């Protein structure tokens, strides 16, 4: 999983109040970070389906959160996908 | 009647051969939990310790291998 220091750095960068850890921007950033960190792992271990299931769960969770955000405030969603480099 | 939960030890140390010898038979086999009365968690820890000791040649796998 992600390190404590990495999560702290991410929540400091994206958190409005620097102590929240639950806002949609922070959660999407954490999921995105974990997915990118797992890119190297699944490139080497292509047969780890049991972990790929968890990865797909993260992906679907992030998709639902991004859909919710885009429905609620288009501006924050646009800024977040620009900062994280997500195509959609 | 588990000795490990009585002393409240955090984890069983594989180097503690003196205590480990009391939970193995003369043939080198592991004595069952239902006989010695050890709690399941400590039983698993004890099994792991016994295997680690066997790998480290501190305990015999069997009584006959020479």
């Amino acid at each position: 999983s992600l390190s404590t220091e990495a999560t702290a750095k991410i929540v400091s960068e994206f958190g409005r109040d620097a102590n929240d850890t639950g806002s949609t921007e922070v959660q999407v950033a954490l999921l995105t970070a974990q997915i990118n960190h797992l890119q190297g792992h699944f490139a080497e271990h292509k047969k780890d389906h049991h972990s790929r299931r968890g990865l797909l769960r993260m992906v679907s969770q992030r998709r639902k959160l991004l859909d919710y955000l885009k429905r609620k405030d288009v501006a924050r969603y646009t800024q977040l996908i620009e900062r994280l480099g997500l195509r959609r | 009647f588990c000795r490990f939960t009585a002393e409240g030890v955090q984890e069983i140390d594989y180097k503690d051969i003196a205590t480990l010898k009391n939970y193995i038979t003369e043939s080198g086999k592991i004595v069952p939990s239902r006989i010695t009365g050890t709690r399941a968690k400590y039983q698993r820890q004890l099994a792991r310790a016994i295997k680690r000791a066997r790998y480290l040649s501190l305990l015999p796998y069997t009584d006959r291998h020479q």
């Binding site: - | 038979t25 003369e26 043939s27 086999k29 009584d63």
Partner: protein
């Protein structure tokens, strides 16, 4: 199961001690178990059946302890 005969000890009691040690260590049962191959489904079903009997006998004894026969 090593048994070394001690001084001033009869052979028959030594043989009995060796037999007792052997049945304690379970070598005969182990060899008879490994005489032929047992499928994983068969051994699982056998262990399940054994547990069912080992629980049923206890419950049967508990019920029989209450009532009388005459």
């Amino acid at each position: 199961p090593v048994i070394k005969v001690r001084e001033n000890e009869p052979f028959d009691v030594a043989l009995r001690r060796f037999k007792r040690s052997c049945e304690k260590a379970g070598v005969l049962a182990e060899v008879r178990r490994r005489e032929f191959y047992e499928k994983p489904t068969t051994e699982r079903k056998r262990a399940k059946a054994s547990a069912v009997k080992r629980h049923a006998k206890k419950l049967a004894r508990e019920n029989a302890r209450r009532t009388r026969l005459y």
